Structure formats: structure tokens, C-alpha cells
Amino acid sequence: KGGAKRHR
Amino acid sequence: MASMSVSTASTEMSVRKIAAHMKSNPNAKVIFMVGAGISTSCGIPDFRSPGTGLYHNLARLKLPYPEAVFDVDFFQSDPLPFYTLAKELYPGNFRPSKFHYLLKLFQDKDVLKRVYTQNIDTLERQAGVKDDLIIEAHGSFAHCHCIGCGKVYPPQVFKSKLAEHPIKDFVKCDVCGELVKPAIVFFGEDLPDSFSETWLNDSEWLREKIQQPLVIVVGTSLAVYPFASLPEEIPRKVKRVLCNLETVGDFKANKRPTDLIVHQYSDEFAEQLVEELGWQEDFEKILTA
Ligand SMILES: Nc1ncnc2c1ncn2[C@@H]1O[C@H](COP(=O)(O)OP(=O)(O)OC[C@H]2NC[C@H](O)[C@@H]2O)[C@@H](O)[C@H]1O
Ligand SMILES: [Zn+2]
């Protein structure tokens, strides 16, 4: 699903 | 709304190609993926920029660095920074750009499949894009919830707190006692389920059409995941376009032969595109109403 909002 | 070109180089010819692909595939539709670059012309203050009043108010409140305002652990220790940002950025304080009104023209001509946005300004919706065509991948202010138990609150009770001098006694849940905040996705939370569900459907739709479709990525650094995974996930045989002052993300890292790069301001790109499509008259009506 993409995971949690983050950088990289 | 007045715009100019970014440099002496003309982008009219590159933009012309986009128009010729839509003229040659007249029942086809476009998916847009957009970020904060498309709302710069609206006067929205960038919370990471020291030239803004927002930046200096957050520093004075002892925020340690800009992005902490969107950090869960930080907000729970001290909600004041986030409440002060919400007061300045709250939807309805700004008006949509010329680029925003291009999305609304595309919808009126029935050539908008979807808009995926990482902005929290809700300016696509404010401009009249329909609810079924938008994915607000980072949430918005239009809903509020308890961070502890998930209980639902109307967004007005949060909004009414922003009008107080000084802001204090933050909204707390009447069931569990924890903080209630807008349905804005913070760093370290997952995105809403509709994001992954609609991309699954739109990824299938794109493969099936290969009326050839177009995906146009506008004003985004492609630095925040999982949003920024979308352009690598576009099918190799569906033509990608990037309208962005700089070449970024998968268009820098893994360029494709058919990738088209247009280094131009979103507003100026809009005006050129409408001219190469022949839609000047219907655009001019949207802009004056
Ligand atoms: N007028 C205009 N037209 C086209 N592209 C533009 C414009 N103005 C800026 N940009 C481009 O848009 C991109 C904006 O990047 P950014 O400021 O990082 O914002 P995002 O949409 O990608 O991200 C949001 C960020 N805001 C809060 C979180 O801190 C995120 O890192 C960047 O690559 C710029 O080259
Ligand atoms: Zn609760």
C-alpha cells in the first residue's frame, strides 16, 4: 500500500 | 493570474506535442499528479521558507525544524505550532490558480480521468473538480478525528478554536480524552485507503488502454513517499509528461525515450496548452465566472 508518509 | 515564461527558451513547441497527442487520440483522458508548485502562484506561504510570517511564528513557538509541525509525537507534546499553521493555511483563505481552472476545463470536456494531489489546500475541489475525480493523498481539513480512539468530529469545532486570542485549551475527545486533529496525513502515518485502491484501478485502466492515455506530473519534487512511487509505476508504453522547473525523481533517475520534460511555471504551461488545444473561449468563461 506504500507504507506511512515519509521521505525517501 | 498574469504569467510569464521561466526563461528566454520557448516551450510552445514542446507543449504543442501534448496537444497533438490529444488531437490524435480524441476519446482518451489524462491522469494528473500534482504538488505544491501548482499553488505557489496563489500566495500560499511556504512554512519552510524564512521569508514568511508563518516560518517566524513557528520558530518563536520553539518548533525545532519545519516538518515537526506534521509529526505525531510532536503534536501530542505540544499542538500550538500546528494550530498556528492551520490558522494561516485554512481552506478558503486563498483562491485557485489558472492551473487549477485548467483541471476544471479538462473535466468539462470530459478528458480528466483523475487528479492525484499531495497538497492540503483543497484548491482542486474549490475550483469545482468533482469529488469522484480527486484523490487527496495527504488528506484535508474537511474531516476531523480523535488520534487515540478514531471517533469522528465535524471540522467546525476545530475551526472555531482558530479564531481565539490567544489560541488555547485545544480540542479533546469526549470519549477517551486525547487530541482531535484534522484528517491531514502526518509524517509516519499511513495515507487513506482510497489512495492505494484508486491507483490499483487506474493502473489496470492504463494497461488496458495501451484512445492512448497521458499522465502529466506538475509541480512536485517527488520527495515524499509513497506518493512519489506513482511515476515509476506508470506503464512503460504510456507516455509520461513532467511540467516542473527542475528534472526530479524517476524522470531524473530512470529516463524513458518517450518522456517529455517541460521546464515551465504551471500557470504559463496552462495558458500555452489551452492555446495549442483551441479552448481559449471556454477557458476565458471559466476564468470570468
Ligand atoms: N510555478 C511552478 N510551476 C511548476 N513547478 C513549480 C512551481 N513552483 C515550484 N515548482 C516545483 O514544484 C516542486 C515543489 O516541491 P515541494 O516544495 O517540495 O513540495 P511538494 O508538493 O512536493 O511537497 C510538499 C512538502 N510540503 C510539506 C512537506 O514538507 C513536503 O516535503 C519543486 O520540484 C519545484 O521545482
Ligand atoms: Zn477518542
- So where are chain B's domains? 1-40+97-137+193-289, 41-96+138-192
Q: Which residues line ligand 1 (CB under 6 A)?
A: B 35-37, 40-41, 67, 118, 219-221, 223-224, 243-246, 248, 265-266
Q: Is the peptide bond before B213 cis (omega within 30 degrees of 0)?
A: no
Smallest CA separation from ligand 1 atom 18, residue: B221
Q: B1-40+97-137+193-289: which CATH topology? A: Rossmann fold (3.40.50)
Resolution reading in Å: 2.0
Continuous H helices in chain B: 12-24, 53-60, 72-77, 80-89, 98-108, 123-126, 155-161, 193-209, 250-253, 266-277, 280-288
Are B138 and A6 in contact (CB < 8 Å)? no
Tell how far the Cα of B168 is from the centroid of ligand 1, in angstroms.
32
B138 is catalytic: yes
User: Closest to B196 (Cβ–Cβ): which among A1, A4, A8?
Assistant: A1
Alpha-carbon torsion (B244, B122, B185, B52), positive or negative: positive
Residues contacting residue B240 through CB under 8 Å, at least 6 positions apart: B215, B217, B231, B234, B251, B256, B258, B259, B260
The ligand minimizing its distance to the Cα of B251 is 1
- Alpha-carbon torsion B150, B155, B160, B161, what sign? positive
What atom of ligand 1 comes closest to residue B244's alpha carbon?
A: 5
d(Cα B190, Cα B269) in Å, to the nearest integer?
33
Q: Which residue is associated with the grid cell 475525480?
A: B133
Rounded distance between C-alpha atoms, residue B263 and residue B265, angstroms: 7
Strand partners, B136: B117
Residues 6+ apart with CB under 8 A from B218: B32, B33, B34, B35, B37, B38, B99, B242, B243, B244, B266, B269
Angle made by CA atoms B192, B193, B196, in degrees to the nearest 5: 110
Are B1-40+97-137+193-289 and B41-96+138-192 in the same CATH fold? Answer: no
- Could you say which ligand is closest to the alpha carbon of residue B177? 2
Grid coordinates representing B13 are: 513547441
Residues on chain B touching A7 (C-beta within 8 angstroms): 187, 223-225
B-chain CB neighbours of A6 within 8 Å are: 187-188, 224-225
**Do the Cβ atoms of A7 and B224 come within 8 Å?**
yes
Name the pairing type of β-strands B139-146 and B180-184. Answer: antiparallel
Sheet with B139-146: list strands edge to edge: B152-153, B139-146, B180-184
In the CATH hierarchy, which top-level class contains the domain B41-96+138-192? alpha beta
**Solving technique for this entry?**
X-ray
